[PDB]
RNA sequence: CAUC
């Protein structure tokens, strides 16, 4: 809920479709943060982002630790 | 739905 960063770039980690969710490492922290299937924005479709992608996100608070939202291409 |  609370927005902790927004335009933030990471890299992907690792995604895996079969459980739905990965981690982004930060470009700005060097930390991982988790991310979702559902914080994916949209792209025969699969919700996902690719192993190695750079993308662009927020960084949100969630109740387990930080997370991913509106993840996207950094355009 | 926290390291596949």
Redesign the pocket.
């Given at each position: 809920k609370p927005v902790l960063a927004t335009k933030v770039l990471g890299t992907v980690?690792?995604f895996?479709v079969?459980?739905?969710?990965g981690?982004i490492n930060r470009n700005d922290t060097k930390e991982?943060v988790?991310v979702?299937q559902?914080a994916i924005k949209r792209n025969k479709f699969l919700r996902s982002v690719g192993?190695g992608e750079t993308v662009e996100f927020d960084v949100v608070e969630?109740?387990?630790?930080?997370?991913a939202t509106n993840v996207t291409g950094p355009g």
């Open positions: 980690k690792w895996n079969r459980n739905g969710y981690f991982d988790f979702h559902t192993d969630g109740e387990k630790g930080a997370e």
